[PDB]
């Protein structure tokens, strides 16, 4: 505690680094703000011989729990298979989108094994589009109203090739009985937007 601003991937000391990884992860201990972007990629869990990077222990992703704000974009293209949601980012409150994936996207979630997103603290995405893509076991994403998180005219979300709404319904994977029409990030009470 309290305020501690850290550089993100592809600026300052990480300017040549492709992903968060086993070598650089420690340097995020106790950051509350990222000044730039977070990239989370397959080479992180695989490791890489050419840059002498060891594989990353998934338990250490939990060092990102303190992070409340990212001034750039968040991009997750790999995640541990036995995590049902993005637990690490449960305290993320703001993605600004001052800088964007391919100039377009400020949040991007691509082909994970998750069954829910889990971003219960997310209240604002200031600029940039959202893309949730190819997550074959993901429910819940169509329940929230994204337009209420947006801050710039022209923001939209592409939610494509994910699990079907019908199959979620048949296995009781909908918002909890006590949520409001505002939707949820998961099956539990503590996951609804408004109470």
């Amino acid at each position, epitope marked *: 505690e309290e305020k501690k601003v850290c550089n993100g991937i592809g600026i300052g000391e990480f300017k040549d680094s492709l992903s968060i990884n086993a070598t650089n992860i420690k340097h995020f201990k106790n950051c509350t703000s990222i000044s730039g972007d977070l990239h989370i*990629l*397959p080479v992180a869990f695989r490791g890489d011989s050419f840059t002498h990077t060891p594989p990353l222990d998934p338990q250490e992703l939990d060092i990102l729990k303190t992070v409340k704000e990212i001034t750039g974009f968040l991009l997750i*293209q*790999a995640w541990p298979e036995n995590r049902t949601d993005l637990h690490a980012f449960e305290n993320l409150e703001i993605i600004r989108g001052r800088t964007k*994936q*391919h100039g*377009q*996207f400020s949040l991007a979630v*691509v*082909s*994970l*094994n998750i069954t829910s997103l889990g971003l219960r603290s997310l209240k604002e995405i200031s600029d940039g589009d959202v*893309i949730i*893509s*190819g997550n*074959k076991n993901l429910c819940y994403a169509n329940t929230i109203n994204w337009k209420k998180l947006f801050g710039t005219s022209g923001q939209k979300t*592409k*939610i*494509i*090739s*994910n*699990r*079907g*709404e*019908n199959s979620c319904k048949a296995t009781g994977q909908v918002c909890h009985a006590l949520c409001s029409p505002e939707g949820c990030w998961g099956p539990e009470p503590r996951d609804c937007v408004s109470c």
Partner: T-cell receptor
Amino acid sequence: EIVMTQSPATLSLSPGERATLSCRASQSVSSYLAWYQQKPGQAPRLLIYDASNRATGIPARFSGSGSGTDFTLTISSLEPEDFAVYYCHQYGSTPLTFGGGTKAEIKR
Amino acid sequence: QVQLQESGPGLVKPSQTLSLTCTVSGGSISSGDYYWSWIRQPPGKGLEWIGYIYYSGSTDYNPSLKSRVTMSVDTSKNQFSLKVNSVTAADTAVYYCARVSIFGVGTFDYWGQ
């Protein structure tokens, strides 16, 4: 899976005529819909994506609209090169699916 | 520049495995931007989606094929592949490979022959 239905399955027209193709989805797909053209012995060629948005190089007489469950491909005026099969395709939910196709046929 | 091409045997006996390779030019197959996919079409009939693979390892298959399909990557040749086991006459089809640009147009763009 979401089922896509194209009817009529065959349209019979002459050059210069206006063409109106229909596509229906059994569950909603927002605007996550594409149209393809296909000629014998050839792979399909993308015409329109997102309902809506025409692909680069695709001639202007080709246009599309609709949302949710109801879609329409419109060829304002046929050219001899437009006779072929047209398929609709949803990418909104897994598994991805296609419709049966409508074939554009030379009235004679 | 981007180019896809299917290859493999044109003939398979009932109950055996079907195998095909797609080769890719004009960009490395290891990339966050693309799903690499397969689609099939029996003569005189409609299009059917088979599945995809991503550079991260993860995959997605049509349940109509009853767990009979696997895909894999081979960066050694910039190639991806299909296996389909326990085949019958219902598997006769023109087989296509195709790319998806996840951050671009967001549906099949380049196709094989």
